[PDB]
Amino acid sequence: FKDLNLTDAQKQQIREIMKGQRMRPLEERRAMHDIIASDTFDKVKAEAQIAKMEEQRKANMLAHMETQNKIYNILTPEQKKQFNANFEKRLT
Numbered sequence: 001f002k003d004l005n006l007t008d009a010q011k012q013q014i015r016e017i018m019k020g021q022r023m024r025p026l027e028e029r030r031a032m033h034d035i036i037a038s039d040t041f042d043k044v045k046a047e048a049q050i051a052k053m054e055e056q057r058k059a060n061m062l063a064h065m066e067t068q069n070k071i072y073n074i075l076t077p078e079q080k081k082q083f084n085a086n087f088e089k090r091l092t
């Protein structure tokens with residue numbers, strides 16, 4: 001919870017970080033839908049969908065971690081302590 005006292009130069013540095021981180025769900029939700037609404041459950045078809053979802057997850061996590069890392073490294077040492085304490089309290 002950005003209680004980090006962000007500097008105005010930090011506020012805009014972050015805004016520029018998000019537009020870049022330092023980039024096939026609909027394709028994914030669609031395939032999920034077709035698995036759920038089928039008369040039967042086909043395990044091998046589901047496993048192929050789960051594998052396809054790992055691709056997208058990989059891209060999304062990489063982008064999310066690199067972004068959060070870029071933000072961490074614009075912080076002052078006191079602000080990094082608060083970032084780190086906040087991290088302990090969030091789940092995502």
Ligand SMILES: [Cl-]
Pocket residue numbers: 029030031033
């Ligand atoms: Cl859908």
Ligand SMILES: [Cl-]
Pocket residue numbers: 087088
């Ligand atoms: Cl942690």
Ligand SMILES: [Zn+2]
Pocket residue numbers: 029030033
């Ligand atoms: Zn649908």
Ligand SMILES: [Zn+2]
Pocket residue numbers: 039
């Ligand atoms: Zn039927």
Ligand SMILES: [Zn+2]
Pocket residue numbers: 087088
């Ligand atoms: Zn931790």
Ligand SMILES: [Zn+2]
Pocket residue numbers: 064068092
């Ligand atoms: Zn996160």
